[PDB]
Design a protein around this ligand. Sequence first.
Ligand code: HEC
Ligand code: HEM
Ligand code: HEM
Ligand SMILES: CO/C=C(/C(=O)OC)c1ccccc1COc1nc2ccc(C)cc2nc1C(F)(F)F
Ligand SMILES: CCCCCCCCO[C@@H]1O[C@H](CO)[C@@H](O)[C@H](O)[C@H]1O
Lengths: 380, 70, 80, 241, 96, 61, 49
Amino acid sequence: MAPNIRKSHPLLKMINNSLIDLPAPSNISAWWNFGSLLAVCLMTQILTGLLLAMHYTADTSLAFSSVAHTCRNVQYGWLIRNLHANGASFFFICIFLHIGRGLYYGSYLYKETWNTGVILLLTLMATAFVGYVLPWGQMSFWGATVITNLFSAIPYIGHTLVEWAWGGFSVDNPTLTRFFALHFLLPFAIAGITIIHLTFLHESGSNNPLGISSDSDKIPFHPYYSFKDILGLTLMLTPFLTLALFSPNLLGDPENFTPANPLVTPPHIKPEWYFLFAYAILRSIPNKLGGVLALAASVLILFLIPFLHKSKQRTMTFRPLSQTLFWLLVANLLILTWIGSQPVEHPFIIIGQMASLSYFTILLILFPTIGTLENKMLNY
Amino acid sequence: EEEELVDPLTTIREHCEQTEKCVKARERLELCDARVSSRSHTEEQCTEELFDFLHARDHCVAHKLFNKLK
Amino acid sequence: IHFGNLARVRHIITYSLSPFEQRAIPNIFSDALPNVWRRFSSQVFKVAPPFLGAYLLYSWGTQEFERLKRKNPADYENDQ
Amino acid sequence: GELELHPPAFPWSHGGPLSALDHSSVRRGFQVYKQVCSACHSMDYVAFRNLIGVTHTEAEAKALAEEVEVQDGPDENGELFMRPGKISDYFPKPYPNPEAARAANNGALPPDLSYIVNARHGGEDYVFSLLTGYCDPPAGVVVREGLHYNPYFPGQAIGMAPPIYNEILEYDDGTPATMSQIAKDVCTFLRWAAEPEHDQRKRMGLKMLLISALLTSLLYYMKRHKWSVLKSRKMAYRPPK
Amino acid sequence: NLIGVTHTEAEAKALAEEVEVQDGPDENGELFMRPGKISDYFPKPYPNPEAARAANNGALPPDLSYIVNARHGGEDYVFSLLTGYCDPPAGVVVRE
Amino acid sequence: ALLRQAYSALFRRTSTFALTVVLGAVLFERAFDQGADAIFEHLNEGKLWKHIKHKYEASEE
Amino acid sequence: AAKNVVTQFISSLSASADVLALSKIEIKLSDIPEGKNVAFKWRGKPLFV
Ligand code: HEC
Ligand code: HEM
Ligand code: HEM
Ligand SMILES: CO/C=C(/C(=O)OC)c1ccccc1COc1nc2ccc(C)cc2nc1C(F)(F)F
Ligand SMILES: CCCCCCCCO[C@@H]1O[C@H](CO)[C@@H](O)[C@H](O)[C@H]1O
């Protein structure tokens, strides 16, 4: 047997070996706080989602009103609804920084942890996609219509997969009910895979800002990082709540306060902020199929980063050239975001094609190149 | 009145049209209107000019109007 | 079990004080802030540049787009 | 033809992050709606009971609801039938369905007003600017018969004839029923109908902030206190050199 | 549903045209009649149960879609009932 | 010396520490709520139903 | 913080405002003659007064 029941117990040993005695680098910065936030966020989305699902009705004649009934009649239903929709945003803000950090500090060298990370991203994106359709407003319907319609651009198997996915000839009730089911389901898969994510991670342990072995200076996750993570939570949570409670409709499209109508196409069909950059890249390539492929790759490109690392150093902490290139990339993304919210007209169309072009260029050409160049400047 | 009911909006609307911003905008409209009204063939319209005026007048009205409403 | 198999280390001494003997946030002005500035300074020129270059692009394109809405009086001169 | 005029920013009494809705203005707005808009505009999501404790008395609200006839049924013979209203009933619909609505408005469809301020960019500023912004079309612009010129409405030709003019009604609280006053009130009322939680939401936001400040502070100390052991730590390399 | 089971496609379309179905609304927002299509369901005898009872002495003839599975006995029960009407034994009085 | 007293009576034994947190919460709630509503309402004098309520509460018809 | 948030969510599960609206019924006794009985719908089922 073992003296303390935290080491021997098949369950308390688990809570312990991953949240209490777990060896963590003594110097990980606040950019290492997002993993826990992502987790907490996930548990939060699930809780508020269940609460909402208990008053929802997956039917085209009742969806829009069931949500209105929830906000108007359910005790604190409005608050739960606010937290859920805005929670999805927080979720993405957190996930984008999580990724950024990983790109900057070369965490992707932990390939399995990284590849499962990508799968989590995709699952989260599909989840928000189906979830967005549920209130059944105008943007819910046209977003669903426009996007799922891209698959018919695939060869042969296309025109089919679409009418199979819709369960009919157009986005209609059968599509709605199957979307509720998927939205209710995917989050659990996310939780599932998140477990796998943390398992692979624990093999190696966390990376750290200098990118050098932290074996000479490890510290117990608790109280160091439990306190640091809890603080990081409250710090983020304040703006989340502030924006949520004081400017509820800041992020939302007003076109969604109008019940879906198949006979009235909205003037400007655009996604929530977190999908804008991808929308921009989608529209950058005029040709239904090539635009689809460009969108696909805009995210699937993440599976390649691990292979385009040429530097002899792990992070960018000591690589000034890569740093600016990195911030160029970040700024490249605000631009695509902005473009994604603008109509398809000059000068936006060309600015858009450029930003897309630069996006893939920076990741596939410049980064690997500058890394090589940098090794020679260190005489390596 | 001796005792009549007036829309504080129309009052404030008048007082605002006296802004240098409005006067200047108002003038360019009257000019467009004039040349457009006096032509049998012309796609020109004074929307843009109307808008700049309305934009300046109404901007001014906003800062004053509610002060005189319950 | 990851504590004990980590690394081969020799001849390093470290000294630390209980948290109840020291100040939680010490030397705010003599040390804290000076470094905050140090850090800010060293990064500004790597970060700021591209963000600024984006603000411009944004600002231009936003205006250039509005300009194309205004009319060109040189299309209604031959209208008498 | 891609020109649009944007409404200004009026200083509503409920614009501050901590500023509630002026319930006297909301009460009046209701009258405007009840006595003017409701003749063409439905407000399917609000019920008479919703007025209770907000703008009206329970007695008042029950009366307002009895002023309306509601179709109930079936009965014993499977027949529909009329009955006086109850506070549990929702505001009455002007027409049976959109088709009938358009028929009575020249093919135009007056939208439900329940979520109007959140369904239009501009909110109450847009609705206010539109109600009080009717005027004559500039040179070169012709509005098709049946439509009216309004610069604030996209396309500028709106199917709604100016709904309000001075003294078109009288407030029983004795407020000068000038046109702008009326629009101001109905807009305040429209904000409430789109989001009844408005006030509670802000009262909470306030508490959320204080607790948020207090907690973030305390946790910052705690974090620093624990980390102090490492922050001040010193070390040396002492080889047997 | 009759097509390919008990009837022809032609036969089925006919059967459906022998019925008037209420569609609508139209331009003026009016309901209106129209001949039946094979996509229509078997017509209801009454608008609602209340009307049904009224026409059967307060009795309500149930929908027959799931009748055989909704009664212990199934087709044996329905058959035995249809062909089992008779006079009450001594001591038993059936209300009018 | 409250810090000293507080430490010996409240923060010493984990048992009294938790008991302190509870009564602390109980008292803090009651107080934080009143003060919060008081601030909120004061900031909105005459706009709430609470305020204009007298005009129709047994003072009409 | 916890106590309130938990309270708020737990409340979400109890009767909504619309359901509560049909909770009680107030009948006018000054409209019911002797002997004659009257039935009012109360909570879906009949109510005899
Ligand atoms: C029926 C004769 C009406 C009365 C009385 C009022 N409104 Fe109306 N409204 C009406 C129509 C037919 C339309 C259609 C406009 C179109 O061409 O689509 C409307 C529309 C509105 C709108 C804005 C519609 C939009 O922005 O797309 C609003 C906000 C609106 N009406 C408000 C409103 C108010 C507040 C009124 C009472 C003061 C009111 N309307 C009366 C017809 C009629
Ligand atoms: C459901 C979403 C996700 C959750 C719950 C999650 C959770 C975690 C957690 C808790 C950590 C450890 C602490 C930290 O460093 O932040 C972690 C680390 C990591 N995650 Fe994620 N993650 C998510 C998505 C992703 C994504 C999208 C990527 C990248 C495509 C990713 C890449 C990584 C990597 C590489 C690490 C290593 C960090 C390091 O030590 O350098 N994760 N993640
Ligand atoms: C990874 C977690 C999840 C994400 C990213 C997420 C995201 C979303 C999004 C973006 C919407 C639309 C919000 C809006 O109205 O604008 C939504 C709505 C909804 N979600 Fe989720 N959700 C998640 C988990 C869940 C879960 C677990 C459930 C069910 C148990 C759930 C139930 C619902 C319901 C009922 C709606 C419709 C009502 C509404 O629109 O608010 N969600 N979700
Ligand atoms: C049902 O549609 C939901 C949309 C949404 O924003 O969800 C939050 C939405 C609304 C309007 C227009 C487009 C969308 C969805 O857009 C996307 N949705 C995506 C969903 C999953 C993945 C992997 C990529 C996606 N890319 C996009 C892209 F923006 F690029 F078009
Ligand atoms: C960071 C966590 C902040 C939590 C703040 C909890 C404050 C919410 O408190 C809420 O205030 C409302 C208005 O008075 C009341 O009606 C609710 O019943 C009450 O729970």
